[PDB]
Amino acid sequence: GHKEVQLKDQILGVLDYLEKQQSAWPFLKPVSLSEAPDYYDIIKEPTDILTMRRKARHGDYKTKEDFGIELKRMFDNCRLYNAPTTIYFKYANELQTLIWPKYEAI
Ligand SMILES: Cc1nnc2c3ccccc3c(N[C@@H](C)[C@H](c3ccccc3)N(C)C)nn12
Ligand SMILES: [Cl-]
């Protein structure tokens, strides 16, 4: 109970730092089929910042690694789908590089 509360707050603190970065804005909501019709043929376990924040608020992450797996998957999904010239691919790398020390300190 108390260990989950401490972890929840730390995860939200990392998601707070993540969302105030300029490269975070495209990750604030899920991709739609209108803008990327074959996105969900390629990405089987989609995620985004708001989804992870809801999950964190509700107590869904029992451990730091449970959060880490999905955080990393947000970036990995993005680079799997998008070509290297896209802003999405480029921001996923900038944003992941920025957040990783914060995630590691959890
Ligand atoms: C993130 C991400 N990774 N791949 C994609 C993608 C691929 C092809 C076309 C569009 C996207 C994409 N669209 C973003 C701009 C778009 C958006 C709109 C408003 C606020 C936040 C985000 N989507 C996620 C709804 N966001 N996105
Ligand atoms: Cl809500």
Author numbering: 1355 to 1460
Tell me what the authors wrote about this structure, in their words.
The development of a small molecule modulator of PCAF Brd would provide a useful tool for interrogating this potential therapeutic target and allow for dissociation of the roles of the Brd and enzymatic domains in disease.
‐45, the first nanomolar, selective, and cell‐active chemical probe of the PCAF bromodomain. ‐45 (pale sticks) binds in the KAc‐binding pocket of PfGCN (blue ribbon and sticks) and makes H‐bonds (dotted lines) through the triazole to N1436 and the first of a network of four water molecules (red spheres). The dimethylamino group forms a salt bridge with E1389. ‐45 (average distance 4.5 Å); a π–π stacking interaction between Y1442 (conserved in PCAF as Y809) and pyridazo ring of the triazolophthalazine motif (average distance 3.7 Å); and characteristic H‐bonds from the triazolophthalazine group and N1436 residue (conserved in PCAF as N803) and a water molecule. ‐45 lies in a hydrophobic groove between W1379 and the alkyl linker of K1383.
